[PDB]
Protein backbone atom coordinates (compact mmCIF):
# COMPACT_ATOMS: atom_id res chain seq x y z
CA UNK A 1 0.00 0.00 0.00
CA UNK A 2 3.07 2.18 0.53
CA UNK A 3 6.06 2.55 -1.79
CA UNK A 4 9.54 3.96 -1.15
CA UNK A 5 11.38 6.33 -3.49
CA UNK A 6 15.16 6.72 -3.25
CA UNK A 7 16.86 9.69 -4.91
CA UNK A 8 20.46 10.04 -6.05
CA UNK A 9 20.95 12.32 -3.04
CA UNK A 10 20.08 9.43 -0.72
CA UNK A 11 16.87 10.64 0.89
CA UNK A 12 14.02 8.11 1.07
CA UNK A 13 10.39 9.19 0.70
CA UNK A 14 7.48 6.90 1.60
CA UNK A 15 4.28 7.52 -0.37
CA UNK A 16 0.84 5.98 -0.66
CA UNK A 17 0.98 3.75 -3.72
CA UNK A 18 -2.37 4.94 -5.11
CA UNK A 19 -0.82 8.40 -5.28
CA UNK A 20 2.35 7.07 -6.92
CA UNK A 21 0.54 5.17 -9.68
CA UNK A 22 -0.47 8.50 -11.25
CA UNK A 23 2.71 8.57 -13.35
CA UNK A 24 2.84 5.94 -16.08
CA UNK A 25 6.61 5.46 -15.93
CA UNK A 26 6.48 4.41 -12.28
CA UNK A 27 3.67 1.97 -13.12
CA UNK A 28 5.78 0.44 -15.92
CA UNK A 29 8.91 0.26 -13.67
CA UNK A 30 6.98 -1.73 -10.99
CA UNK A 31 5.67 -4.07 -13.76
CA UNK A 32 8.12 -6.85 -14.73
CA UNK A 33 10.41 -9.14 -12.64
CA UNK A 34 11.27 -6.22 -10.30
CA UNK A 35 8.14 -6.71 -8.17
CA UNK A 36 10.35 -5.55 -5.25
CA UNK A 37 8.61 -7.56 -2.50
CA UNK A 38 8.25 -1.57 -2.04
CA UNK A 39 11.33 0.58 -2.67
CA UNK A 40 12.47 2.36 -5.85
CA UNK A 41 15.80 4.07 -6.49
CA UNK A 42 16.72 6.59 -9.19
CA UNK A 43 20.46 6.96 -9.72
CA UNK A 44 20.30 10.52 -11.09
CA UNK A 45 17.34 12.46 -9.64
CA UNK A 46 18.23 14.82 -6.76
CA UNK A 47 16.08 14.77 -3.65
CA UNK A 48 14.50 18.23 -3.77
CA UNK A 49 13.01 17.98 -7.26
CA UNK A 50 11.63 14.53 -6.44
CA UNK A 51 10.04 16.03 -3.32
CA UNK A 52 8.39 18.67 -5.50
CA UNK A 53 7.19 15.85 -7.76
CA UNK A 54 5.69 14.07 -4.74
CA UNK A 55 3.93 17.28 -3.74
CA UNK A 56 2.56 17.44 -7.28
CA UNK A 57 1.26 13.89 -6.83
CA UNK A 58 -0.57 14.71 -3.61
CA UNK A 59 -1.85 18.06 -4.90
CA UNK A 60 -3.35 16.39 -7.97
CA UNK A 61 -4.79 13.71 -5.67
CA UNK A 62 -6.53 16.30 -3.45
CA UNK A 63 -8.35 18.10 -6.31
CA UNK A 64 -9.77 15.93 -9.14
CA UNK A 65 -12.70 17.51 -11.09
CA UNK A 66 -13.27 19.37 -7.77
CA UNK A 67 -15.71 22.36 -7.91
CA UNK A 68 -14.58 26.06 -7.51
CA UNK A 69 -11.10 27.61 -8.10
CA UNK A 70 -8.10 25.21 -7.80
CA UNK A 71 -5.04 26.81 -5.98
CA UNK A 72 -2.11 27.24 -8.42
CA UNK A 73 1.04 25.20 -7.84
CA UNK A 74 3.93 27.49 -6.82
CA UNK A 75 7.09 27.18 -8.91
CA UNK A 76 10.53 28.41 -7.93
CA UNK A 77 12.38 30.25 -10.72
CA UNK A 78 15.65 28.29 -10.83
CA UNK A 79 14.10 24.82 -10.51
CA UNK A 80 11.73 25.40 -13.44
CA UNK A 81 14.20 24.01 -16.00
CA UNK A 82 14.97 21.01 -13.79
CA UNK A 83 11.25 20.27 -13.44
CA UNK A 84 10.82 20.45 -17.21
CA UNK A 85 13.67 18.00 -17.60
CA UNK A 86 12.37 15.64 -14.93
CA UNK A 87 8.85 15.59 -16.38
CA UNK A 88 9.92 13.32 -19.25
CA UNK A 89 11.72 10.59 -17.31
CA UNK A 90 8.63 10.13 -15.11
CA UNK A 91 6.04 10.90 -17.83
CA UNK A 92 3.45 12.27 -15.41
Amino acid sequence: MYVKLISSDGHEFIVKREHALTSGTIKAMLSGPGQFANEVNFREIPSHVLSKVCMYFTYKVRYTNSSTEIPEFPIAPEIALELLMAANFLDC
Binding site: V53, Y56, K60, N65, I70, F73, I75, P77, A80, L81, L83, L84, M85, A87, N88, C92
Partner: protein, 157 residues
Protein backbone atom coordinates in the same frame (compact mmCIF):
# COMPACT_ATOMS: atom_id res chain seq x y z
CA UNK B 1 -12.33 12.15 -48.45
CA UNK B 2 -9.15 10.54 -47.27
CA UNK B 3 -7.20 11.23 -50.46
CA UNK B 4 -8.15 14.96 -50.29
CA UNK B 5 -7.09 15.54 -46.59
CA UNK B 6 -3.73 13.81 -47.36
CA UNK B 7 -2.61 16.63 -49.73
CA UNK B 8 -2.57 19.98 -47.92
CA UNK B 9 -5.79 21.78 -49.15
CA UNK B 10 -4.64 24.94 -47.38
CA UNK B 11 -6.19 28.18 -48.63
CA UNK B 12 -4.43 31.56 -48.80
CA UNK B 13 -4.92 32.68 -45.19
CA UNK B 14 -4.09 29.20 -43.90
CA UNK B 15 -7.41 27.55 -43.09
CA UNK B 16 -7.99 23.82 -43.57
CA UNK B 17 -11.06 21.58 -43.67
CA UNK B 18 -11.61 21.68 -39.91
CA UNK B 19 -11.27 25.46 -39.63
CA UNK B 20 -13.83 26.05 -42.38
CA UNK B 21 -16.13 23.40 -40.90
CA UNK B 22 -16.18 24.79 -37.37
CA UNK B 23 -16.58 28.53 -37.92
CA UNK B 24 -19.33 30.47 -39.66
CA UNK B 25 -19.71 29.23 -43.25
CA UNK B 26 -20.08 32.56 -45.04
CA UNK B 27 -20.57 31.51 -48.70
CA UNK B 28 -23.77 29.55 -48.07
CA UNK B 29 -26.27 30.73 -50.68
CA UNK B 30 -28.58 29.65 -53.52
CA UNK B 31 -30.57 27.18 -51.40
CA UNK B 32 -27.40 25.87 -49.77
CA UNK B 33 -28.06 28.34 -46.96
CA UNK B 34 -31.59 26.90 -46.64
CA UNK B 35 -32.55 23.52 -45.15
CA UNK B 36 -29.00 22.18 -45.63
CA UNK B 37 -25.38 22.86 -44.71
CA UNK B 38 -25.82 24.59 -41.37
CA UNK B 39 -22.56 26.21 -40.31
CA UNK B 40 -20.67 24.91 -37.27
CA UNK B 41 -22.37 21.55 -37.70
CA UNK B 42 -21.11 18.51 -35.81
CA UNK B 43 -21.54 15.49 -38.10
CA UNK B 44 -19.28 16.86 -40.85
CA UNK B 45 -16.49 17.54 -38.35
CA UNK B 46 -16.99 14.08 -36.83
CA UNK B 47 -16.61 12.50 -40.27
CA UNK B 48 -13.54 14.62 -41.02
CA UNK B 49 -11.92 13.61 -37.73
CA UNK B 50 -12.74 9.96 -38.38
CA UNK B 51 -11.07 10.09 -41.80
CA UNK B 52 -7.92 11.25 -40.01
CA UNK B 53 -7.41 14.98 -40.44
CA UNK B 54 -4.74 16.56 -38.26
CA UNK B 55 -6.27 17.85 -35.03
CA UNK B 56 -3.89 20.62 -33.91
CA UNK B 57 -3.24 21.95 -37.40
CA UNK B 58 -1.16 25.11 -37.06
CA UNK B 59 -2.70 28.38 -38.23
CA UNK B 60 -0.96 31.57 -39.33
CA UNK B 61 -2.74 33.18 -36.37
CA UNK B 62 -2.62 29.93 -34.37
CA UNK B 63 -6.36 29.55 -33.83
CA UNK B 64 -5.52 25.83 -33.84
CA UNK B 65 -9.14 24.71 -34.46
CA UNK B 66 -10.02 25.52 -30.82
CA UNK B 67 -9.91 29.31 -30.56
CA UNK B 68 -12.37 29.26 -33.46
CA UNK B 69 -14.99 27.25 -31.55
CA UNK B 70 -15.17 29.63 -28.58
CA UNK B 71 -15.83 32.63 -30.86
CA UNK B 72 -19.23 31.18 -31.74
CA UNK B 73 -21.27 34.38 -31.10
CA UNK B 74 -24.64 33.21 -29.69
CA UNK B 75 -24.03 29.98 -27.72
CA UNK B 76 -27.67 29.07 -27.05
CA UNK B 77 -28.26 28.68 -30.78
CA UNK B 78 -27.27 25.08 -31.58
CA UNK B 79 -25.93 24.75 -28.04
CA UNK B 80 -25.98 20.94 -28.08
CA UNK B 81 -23.95 21.00 -31.29
CA UNK B 82 -21.38 23.18 -29.53
CA UNK B 83 -21.22 20.75 -26.61
CA UNK B 84 -20.79 17.77 -28.94
CA UNK B 85 -18.16 19.52 -31.06
CA UNK B 86 -16.17 20.46 -27.95
CA UNK B 87 -16.36 16.85 -26.75
CA UNK B 88 -15.15 15.64 -30.14
CA UNK B 89 -12.33 18.19 -30.30
CA UNK B 90 -10.99 17.43 -26.82
CA UNK B 91 -11.09 13.83 -28.02
CA UNK B 92 -8.08 12.70 -30.09
CA UNK B 93 -5.58 14.68 -28.03
CA UNK B 94 -5.99 18.33 -28.96
CA UNK B 95 -3.67 20.26 -26.60
CA UNK B 96 -5.95 22.44 -24.50
CA UNK B 97 -3.60 25.41 -23.99
CA UNK B 98 -1.97 26.62 -27.23
CA UNK B 99 -0.63 30.13 -27.84
CA UNK B 100 0.62 31.65 -31.12
CA UNK B 101 2.20 35.11 -31.50
CA UNK B 102 0.84 36.86 -28.39
CA UNK B 103 -0.24 34.39 -25.73
CA UNK B 104 -3.71 33.27 -26.86
CA UNK B 105 -5.01 30.83 -24.29
CA UNK B 106 -8.39 29.51 -25.51
CA UNK B 107 -9.80 30.43 -22.09
CA UNK B 108 -8.87 34.09 -22.61
CA UNK B 109 -10.02 34.42 -26.22
CA UNK B 110 -13.32 32.78 -25.24
CA UNK B 111 -15.96 35.43 -24.53
CA UNK B 112 -19.18 33.39 -24.56
CA UNK B 113 -19.66 32.63 -20.86
CA UNK B 114 -21.01 29.12 -20.31
CA UNK B 115 -18.94 27.76 -23.20
CA UNK B 116 -15.83 28.71 -21.22
CA UNK B 117 -17.10 26.55 -18.37
CA UNK B 118 -17.54 23.62 -20.76
CA UNK B 119 -13.85 23.81 -21.63
CA UNK B 120 -13.03 23.82 -17.91
CA UNK B 121 -14.94 20.54 -17.63
CA UNK B 122 -12.53 18.92 -20.10
CA UNK B 123 -9.06 20.19 -19.15
CA UNK B 124 -6.54 17.73 -17.72
CA UNK B 125 -3.73 19.04 -15.52
CA UNK B 126 -0.21 17.90 -16.35
CA UNK B 127 3.01 18.77 -14.56
CA UNK B 128 4.77 19.11 -17.91
CA UNK B 129 2.37 21.78 -19.27
CA UNK B 130 2.24 23.65 -15.93
CA UNK B 131 6.03 23.72 -15.62
CA UNK B 132 6.31 24.80 -19.29
CA UNK B 133 3.98 27.73 -18.55
CA UNK B 134 6.00 28.59 -15.44
CA UNK B 135 9.30 28.65 -17.34
CA UNK B 136 7.66 30.61 -20.20
CA UNK B 137 6.61 33.17 -17.58
CA UNK B 138 10.32 33.83 -17.09
CA UNK B 139 12.97 34.26 -19.81
CA UNK B 140 15.33 31.28 -19.53
CA UNK B 141 17.75 29.87 -22.09
CA UNK B 142 16.42 26.62 -23.56
CA UNK B 143 18.81 26.10 -26.49
CA UNK B 144 20.88 22.88 -26.39
CA UNK B 145 20.12 22.45 -22.67
CA UNK B 146 17.01 20.23 -22.94
CA UNK B 147 16.38 17.31 -25.34
CA UNK B 148 15.32 18.06 -28.89
CA UNK B 149 11.66 17.06 -28.56
CA UNK B 150 10.78 19.40 -25.70
CA UNK B 151 12.15 22.46 -27.51
CA UNK B 152 9.06 22.34 -29.72
CA UNK B 153 7.00 21.59 -26.56
CA UNK B 154 8.44 24.55 -24.53
CA UNK B 155 8.02 26.59 -27.76
CA UNK B 156 4.27 25.72 -27.88
CA UNK B 157 3.91 27.23 -24.37
Amino acid sequence: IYNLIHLDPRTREGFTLLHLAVNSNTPVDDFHTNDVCSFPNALVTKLLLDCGAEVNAVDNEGNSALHIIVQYNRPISDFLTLHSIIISLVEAGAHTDMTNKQNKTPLDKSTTGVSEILLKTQMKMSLKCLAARAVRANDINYQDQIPRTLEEFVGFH
